Design a protein around this ligand. Structure first.
Ligand SMILES: O=c1[nH]cnc2c1ncn2[C@@H]1O[C@H](COP(=O)(O)O)[C@@H](O)[C@H]1O
Ligand SMILES: O=c1[nH]cnc2c1ncn2[C@@H]1O[C@H](COP(=O)(O)O)[C@@H](O)[C@H]1O
Ligand SMILES: O=c1[nH]cnc2c1ncn2[C@@H]1O[C@H](COP(=O)(O)O)[C@@H](O)[C@H]1O
Ligand SMILES: [Mg+2]
Lengths: 430, 431
């Protein structure tokens, strides 16, 4: 009737929750593993067989040779970066990837100048207002602005008449040089490279809408959708303007792939045992102290895309319940629980107080979020190493209580618990 | 159940102007909440009840129901001057206390006057540079969504907070646009004065939309209707780019526009016009540049209600419909303007597309390919009869019923309503 329903993995915080780990796991027997929104500003690390892979644009299931990796229409692609990412992983064993990667011809293109303007605008905001967004400078925002302006160019444009394309590229090139006179654009060189890219990508392009429709209404197939960024980075629902420029929430799956809501099955909310965010913006449970350094250090909290040190803090339920209100999580994945193995006590934010009084819901004005005072509940730590745990019973009593604590306050079941970096580290609960 | 009640959605399945105002109004009669989830004030939905004819652009067409709350979601871009100007025109038509039943989400973005000016300027520029433009409605929708993506745009909540800080932000956003167009004239001070006034006037209507909708869907049972603006082929992602609007007017936009997950989406109705209309330059496979096209244009009153520009007309095109279904997953359809076909001896219908020589099983994303497609038509006999008074499926002659089935069968979606007139009573429910 409605066909197959896709399985979705979404970030429930400010990203870096370990989505690639849940996806790689769910990907072992998936037919299609796809990318939604965003671009290579996203950065995941997959650990399979004591082997580490850094992915940005490639769906994590690219490691599965029996599965087809798909990039949807909502994604913005930077060609030089795409192949750069792929080749970087070939050196690690990634083979025959081009033969199992499909790209929707409606995806927009991130050009080199889009990346430069991104940095330029950032430097501008940091020199004029003394405070910028903390973008990854990958040109994601500028690319989505062009998309909204309908001046941007897409995969299908690239594979179409090159003369027409070139003409459009040039027009788009000058426009950015108008609002940004100090922007340098080697138009001839970029076009030359792009023409080379056109042929390397031609065989991998397909009409995306038709591709997915056919996979969902033909014989049963397991389709997995990898979310990028996270709920609180969502352009609409995040801590605007300190967010990414795409919808990282469930709605983004429908708009990024061309599938209706009835073709969405399980939606997993990836929740890191503690909270982090890299970039500018309000962070209520942020711990800028000894505890903060400990989480950061033990969690190897560094952006894989930029390398910047991530800000760390306690789990925050306010943002998790908000994320759930928008995403409607069917189940949760609690990752990096082992990072807390050495804490005698573990605090978790349960509500935000403003001038001494609890606010009823997550605020739209991120500034108010800067003045709130977090109400914490202090749970007992387990002070034991859980990295070797492979089943629920291997977890000490207090670690188990922590898991249940989240499960009970969310009203959503925890299906996986991460105690390591390897695919085996995950603990399936049901 | 724990999931909550589900919302009903009405979407355009072609290139707009399908007759959505009528379907929305009909479904609103007993709706607790009627809302807009995406787009700006260029909906142009038409409602005809009790002799009166209402036009809505930014306001939900259910604003007419004094028993329901009209809601503007977070995915919407709002031009305050246009909003109240739209409300007043209708007010003088009998609409009253609308401000008392209009709720606005505090995360919705603001379309500023300079955003509108830039739309026009870029259009004039592009016009006399590439020979042709995008053909926007010049309501600043594109530039506003452009600002949203850049994260330099301002929102309702920003307008209601410290005005001084708001002012500081506005000025920066204002100057930024003056760089793109050093021809852009902006009375910064005046525009801020008018905005200060709009803020105090809109203040009592604003609320946190995410929470408001959540509560509406999880408390005592309520029926929420979602009014889609524009249409599938105008969708920023799935439409005939670049001749599209800058929002997701497809079903997903409902989730991203109101902040509700897929389990809260129920019936999704696709408004299908009995024939096809397109506005502006661009590929139109079934276009009829002849007497038949003239006939459709005249009988369907297909023309810019304001600018007066005539709309391009052609036969029904099942290729765009199936494509719109693949994206939207319609649960039922509203087949509109069947009456316009009352006089034809026969009706053609595009059933498939043929390229260089073989049929293409998909709707092309590129304008050049879509411009090259060969259309295979199916000729159906007309009913040659006035169906204006029809009110039961049994009132429609054989060839009309046959035409309704054709659409149903070829799209794979059942037809729930058949429209034969502008008025609310000019409908036929089939189930
Ligand atoms: O995957 C990610 N992990 C963490 N933060 C991210 C990720 N992608 C984007 N962001 C944040 O999103 C904001 C906007 O950056 P942009 O997406 O590069 O425009 C910044 O604060 C980034 O740090
Ligand atoms: O079934 C119908 N027959 C004829 N005209 C209709 C029908 N339904 C709606 N219309 C008209 O179609 C036009 C476009 O509708 P809109 O999509 O609400 O703007 C309006 O002028 C409506 O009054
Ligand atoms: O009257 C109309 N009916 C249907 N589509 C329209 C009309 N006017 C403009 N459009 C299309 O809508 C697109 C987006 O315009 P915008 O929503 O004003 O940004 C334009 O590029 C046109 O292709
Ligand atoms: Mg209209």
């Amino acid at each position: 009737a409605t066909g197959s329903r896709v399985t979705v993995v979404l970030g429930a915080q400010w990203g870096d929750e370990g989505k690639g780990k849940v996806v790689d796991l769910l990907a072992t027997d998936a037919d299609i593993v796809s990318r939604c929104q965003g671009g290579n500003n996203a950065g995941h690390t997959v650990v399979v067989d004591g082997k580490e892979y850094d992915f940005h644009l490639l769906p994590s299931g690219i490691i599965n040779t029996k599965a087809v990796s798909f990039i949807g229409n909502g994604v913005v692609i930077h060609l030089p970066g795409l192949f750069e990412e792929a080749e970087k992983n070939e050196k690690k064993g990634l083979k025959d990837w081009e033969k199992r990667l499909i790209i929707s011809d409606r995806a927009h293109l991130v050009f080199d100048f889009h990346q430069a303007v991104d940095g330029l605008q950032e430097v501008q905001r940091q020199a004029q207002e003394g405070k910028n967004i903390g973008t990854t400078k990958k040109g994601i925002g500028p690319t989505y602005s062009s998309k909204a302006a309908r001046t941007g160019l897409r995969i299908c444009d690239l594979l179409s008449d090159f003369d027409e394309f070139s003409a459009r590229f040039k027009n788009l090139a000058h426009q950015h040089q108008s609002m940004f006179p100090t922007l340098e654009i080697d138009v001839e060189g970029q076009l030359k490279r792009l023409k080379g890219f056109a042929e390397r990508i031609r065989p991998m392009v397909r009409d995306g809408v038709y591709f997915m429709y056919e996979a969902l209404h033909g014989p049963p197939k397991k389709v997995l959708v990898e979310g990028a960024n996270a709920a609180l980075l969502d352009i609409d629902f995040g801590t605007y303007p300190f967010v990414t420029s795409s919808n990282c929430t469930v709605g983004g799956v429908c708009t990024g792939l061309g599938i209706p809501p009835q073709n969405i099955g399980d939606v997993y909310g990836v929740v890191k045992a503690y909270t982090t965010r890299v970039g500018i913006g309000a962070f209520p449970t942020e711990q800028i102290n000894e505890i903060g350094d400990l989480l950061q250090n033990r969690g190897h909290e560094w952006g894989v895309t930029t390398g910047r040190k991530r800000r760390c803090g306690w789990l925050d339920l306010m943002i998790l319940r908000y994320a759930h209100m928008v995403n409607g999580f069917t189940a949760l994945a609690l990752t990096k629980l082992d990072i807390l193995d050495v804490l005698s006590e573990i605090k978790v934010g349960i509500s935000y107080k403003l001038n001494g009084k609890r606010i009823p819901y997550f605020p739209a004005n991120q500034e108010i979020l800067q003045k709130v005072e977090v109400e914490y509940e202090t749970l007992p730590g387990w002070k034991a190493d859980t990295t070797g745990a492979r089943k629920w019973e291997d977890l000490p009593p207090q670690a188990q209580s922590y898991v249940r604590f989240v499960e009970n306050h969310m009203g959503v079941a925890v299906k996986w618990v991460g105690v390591g970096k390897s695919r085996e580290s995950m603990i399936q609960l049901f």
